[PDB]
Design a protein around this motif. Structure first.
Motif, mmCIF file in Angstrom:
data_model
loop_
_atom_site.group_PDB
_atom_site.id
_atom_site.type_symbol
_atom_site.label_atom_id
_atom_site.label_comp_id
_atom_site.label_asym_id
_atom_site.label_seq_id
_atom_site.Cartn_x
_atom_site.Cartn_y
_atom_site.Cartn_z
ATOM 1 N N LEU A 116 -3.660 7.406 -9.720
ATOM 2 C CA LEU A 116 -3.800 6.211 -8.854
ATOM 3 C C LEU A 116 -3.556 4.927 -9.666
ATOM 4 O O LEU A 116 -2.952 4.012 -9.170
ATOM 5 C CB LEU A 116 -5.172 6.195 -8.189
ATOM 6 C CG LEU A 116 -5.585 7.268 -7.174
ATOM 7 C CD1 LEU A 116 -6.993 7.020 -6.661
ATOM 8 C CD2 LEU A 116 -4.729 7.232 -6.010
ATOM 9 N N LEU A 161 -8.441 1.888 4.024
ATOM 10 C CA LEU A 161 -7.136 1.606 4.505
ATOM 11 C C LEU A 161 -7.154 2.100 5.955
ATOM 12 O O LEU A 161 -7.502 3.294 6.203
ATOM 13 C CB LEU A 161 -6.092 2.409 3.724
ATOM 14 C CG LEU A 161 -5.956 2.039 2.257
ATOM 15 C CD1 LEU A 161 -4.849 2.855 1.630
ATOM 16 C CD2 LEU A 161 -5.640 0.580 2.065
ATOM 17 N N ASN A 221 -3.643 -2.172 9.126
ATOM 18 C CA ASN A 221 -2.316 -2.399 9.619
ATOM 19 C C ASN A 221 -2.387 -2.287 11.141
ATOM 20 O O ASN A 221 -2.909 -1.308 11.687
ATOM 21 C CB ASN A 221 -1.325 -1.356 9.116
ATOM 22 C CG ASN A 221 -0.916 -1.537 7.655
ATOM 23 O OD1 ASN A 221 -0.733 -0.531 6.877
ATOM 24 N ND2 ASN A 221 -0.888 -2.729 7.241
ATOM 25 N N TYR A 243 -7.737 -3.004 4.023
ATOM 26 C CA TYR A 243 -6.515 -3.391 4.690
ATOM 27 C C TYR A 243 -6.514 -2.694 6.060
ATOM 28 O O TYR A 243 -6.864 -1.545 6.177
ATOM 29 C CB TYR A 243 -5.268 -2.923 3.951
ATOM 30 C CG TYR A 243 -4.887 -3.749 2.755
ATOM 31 C CD1 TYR A 243 -4.949 -5.156 2.791
ATOM 32 C CD2 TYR A 243 -4.456 -3.154 1.588
ATOM 33 C CE1 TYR A 243 -4.580 -5.910 1.688
ATOM 34 C CE2 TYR A 243 -4.097 -3.931 0.477
ATOM 35 C CZ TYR A 243 -4.104 -5.295 0.535
ATOM 36 O OH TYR A 243 -3.726 -6.064 -0.568
ATOM 37 N N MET A 299 0.792 -1.184 0.000
ATOM 38 C CA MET A 299 0.000 0.000 0.000
ATOM 39 C C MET A 299 0.852 1.274 0.000
ATOM 40 O O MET A 299 1.795 1.350 0.724
ATOM 41 C CB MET A 299 -0.968 -0.026 1.160
ATOM 42 C CG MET A 299 -0.533 0.630 2.408
ATOM 43 S SD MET A 299 -1.766 0.676 3.728
ATOM 44 C CE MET A 299 -2.006 -1.112 3.796
ATOM 45 N N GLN A 321 -11.979 10.129 0.360
ATOM 46 C CA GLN A 321 -10.536 10.068 -0.044
ATOM 47 C C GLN A 321 -10.401 9.618 -1.484
ATOM 48 O O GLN A 321 -11.185 8.808 -1.998
ATOM 49 C CB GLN A 321 -9.761 9.138 0.874
ATOM 50 C CG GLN A 321 -9.700 9.708 2.284
ATOM 51 C CD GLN A 321 -9.045 11.067 2.284
ATOM 52 O OE1 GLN A 321 -7.866 11.155 2.039
ATOM 53 N NE2 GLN A 321 -9.836 12.160 2.458
ATOM 54 N N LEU A 322 -9.361 10.141 -2.119
ATOM 55 C CA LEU A 322 -8.923 9.669 -3.418
ATOM 56 C C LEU A 322 -8.096 8.404 -3.226
ATOM 57 O O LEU A 322 -6.904 8.433 -2.802
ATOM 58 C CB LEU A 322 -8.134 10.827 -4.087
ATOM 59 C CG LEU A 322 -7.596 10.621 -5.507
ATOM 60 C CD1 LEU A 322 -8.715 10.201 -6.442
ATOM 61 C CD2 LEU A 322 -6.941 11.938 -5.984
ATOM 62 N N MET A 323 -8.682 7.272 -3.581
ATOM 63 C CA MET A 323 -8.059 5.975 -3.355
ATOM 64 C C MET A 323 -8.377 4.912 -4.355
ATOM 65 O O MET A 323 -9.364 4.986 -4.971
ATOM 66 C CB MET A 323 -8.433 5.368 -1.990
ATOM 67 C CG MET A 323 -8.802 6.253 -0.850
ATOM 68 S SD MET A 323 -9.256 5.293 0.632
ATOM 69 C CE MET A 323 -8.180 3.986 0.693
ATOM 70 N N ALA A 324 -7.554 3.890 -4.433
ATOM 71 C CA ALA A 324 -7.878 2.751 -5.319
ATOM 72 C C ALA A 324 -7.426 1.486 -4.561
ATOM 73 O O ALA A 324 -6.461 1.512 -3.788
ATOM 74 C CB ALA A 324 -7.204 2.862 -6.637
ATOM 75 N N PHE A 325 -8.103 0.372 -4.805
ATOM 76 C CA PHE A 325 -7.704 -0.915 -4.253
ATOM 77 C C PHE A 325 -7.793 -1.867 -5.429
ATOM 78 O O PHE A 325 -8.881 -1.991 -6.044
ATOM 79 C CB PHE A 325 -8.668 -1.269 -3.105
ATOM 80 C CG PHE A 325 -8.229 -2.412 -2.245
ATOM 81 C CD1 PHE A 325 -8.156 -3.674 -2.738
ATOM 82 C CD2 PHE A 325 -8.002 -2.198 -0.901
ATOM 83 C CE1 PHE A 325 -7.679 -4.711 -1.910
ATOM 84 C CE2 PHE A 325 -7.637 -3.217 -0.059
ATOM 85 C CZ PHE A 325 -7.457 -4.456 -0.562
ATOM 86 N N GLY A 326 -6.675 -2.484 -5.752
ATOM 87 C CA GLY A 326 -6.587 -3.321 -6.950
ATOM 88 C C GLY A 326 -6.889 -2.617 -8.253
ATOM 89 O O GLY A 326 -7.399 -3.234 -9.234
ATOM 90 N N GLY A 327 -6.621 -1.321 -8.281
ATOM 91 C CA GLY A 327 -6.936 -0.527 -9.486
ATOM 92 C C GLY A 327 -8.373 -0.147 -9.702
ATOM 93 O O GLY A 327 -8.710 0.405 -10.728
ATOM 94 N N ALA A 345 -2.935 -1.216 -3.055
ATOM 95 C CA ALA A 345 -3.757 -0.098 -2.684
ATOM 96 C C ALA A 345 -2.970 1.215 -2.752
ATOM 97 O O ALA A 345 -1.821 1.264 -2.352
ATOM 98 C CB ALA A 345 -4.370 -0.271 -1.276
ATOM 99 N N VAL A 346 -3.643 2.269 -3.206
ATOM 100 C CA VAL A 346 -3.041 3.579 -3.353
ATOM 101 C C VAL A 346 -3.953 4.608 -2.870
ATOM 102 O O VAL A 346 -5.169 4.508 -3.033
ATOM 103 C CB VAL A 346 -2.647 3.866 -4.825
ATOM 104 C CG1 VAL A 346 -2.048 5.228 -4.933
ATOM 105 C CG2 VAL A 346 -1.617 2.857 -5.273
ATOM 106 N N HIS A 347 -3.383 5.639 -2.242
ATOM 107 C CA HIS A 347 -4.163 6.683 -1.602
ATOM 108 C C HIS A 347 -3.348 7.973 -1.805
ATOM 109 O O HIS A 347 -2.213 8.060 -1.365
ATOM 110 C CB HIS A 347 -4.277 6.307 -0.125
ATOM 111 C CG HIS A 347 -5.046 7.271 0.739
ATOM 112 N ND1 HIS A 347 -4.930 7.220 2.106
ATOM 113 C CD2 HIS A 347 -5.873 8.306 0.469
ATOM 114 C CE1 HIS A 347 -5.685 8.161 2.643
ATOM 115 N NE2 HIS A 347 -6.238 8.862 1.669
ATOM 116 N N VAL A 348 -4.010 9.004 -2.281
ATOM 117 C CA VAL A 348 -3.409 10.264 -2.539
ATOM 118 C C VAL A 348 -4.230 11.354 -1.867
ATOM 119 O O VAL A 348 -5.490 11.403 -1.997
ATOM 120 C CB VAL A 348 -3.309 10.518 -4.067
ATOM 121 C CG1 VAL A 348 -2.829 11.924 -4.344
ATOM 122 C CG2 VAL A 348 -2.391 9.501 -4.738
#
Lengths: 114, 114, 113
Positions: A19, C58, C97, C95, A2, C45-51, A38-41
């Motif tokens: 993203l 998160l 953590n 996810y 992530m 939020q600006l987000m992606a999970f698996g594209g 996972a990606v978050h900006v």
């Protein structure tokens, strides 16, 4: 894996593709399928780097493995490159904290990876 | 060093000059040059502390070294003092997590600090 | 214990009382008094999970102790359940953590624990 980016660059300056690009590039860099990434900006942040409010980024990369001295040097090139090109941030105004997570300490889908 | 504050205090209540003051105070506290200090303040957050929505903050301080029992007591006095004086948050509604980072796990400008 | 959830779900979809519920449930789950539980929810939020940009989250849970193999499985079931029922986020798009914090590394009330 992530990847999180916090930046003072405004929301309208984050390309709509950023993203997905990060997702694809991080999959290649980590060797993990893109479905796992996972990606978050987070733009428009109130931040300073060296006492200046010029564009900067504070980032993190968490992964179960694929973290270490050599790999982290390589990620920093990859990710500085992407933030410089897409968000116009100087690479010397980027910090990336790297976290090698134990699988028991990552939750997903009602359970952990352990 | 990197210091991040998340708070439910509104943006208008963050003084002009707060990020510079944090940068300067942290440089003195940590002995690290101000050119390398990053600060990030995130107001207007949806948060609760002890079940209450009164002013509170969740923070973190990351540093490569200069983290430890006695030093963290001192930082907490410093930073709680600043949050109470500048943002009017009671010290008992503040948590600060401290992280002693391995230089190999801090990326900066296309490499790491290792 | 401190629980943070970042999500692309919109703020209007976070139900009234969600932060109270998280406080109460995490106190039960961790055995810590609710007075010391902190919760932070960040929607839009600006987000992606698996594209994919479908609803996802998160999260992190930090605690001084009460972190480990079995306990974390139990928290994940609890928290993924709550994100699914309350925010309509599929568990396989979350996810979490987990961090076991040393007491000497947690500041509070002008000192550390």
């Amino acid at each position: 894996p992530m990847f999180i980016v916090n930046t003072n660059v405004p929301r309208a300056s984050v390309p709509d593709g950023f993203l997905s690009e990060l997702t694809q590039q991080l999959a290649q860099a980590t060797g993990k399928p893109p479905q796992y990434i996972a990606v978050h900006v987070v733009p428009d942040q109130l931040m300073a780097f060296g006492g200046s409010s010029e564009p900067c980024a504070l980032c993190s990369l968490h992964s179960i493995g694929k973290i270490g001295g050599a790999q982290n040097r390589s990620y920093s090139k990859l990710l500085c490159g992407l933030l410089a090109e897409r968000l116009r941030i100087s690479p010397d105004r980027v910090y990336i904290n790297y976290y090698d997570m134990n699988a028991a300490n990552v939750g997903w889908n009602n359970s952990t990876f352990a």
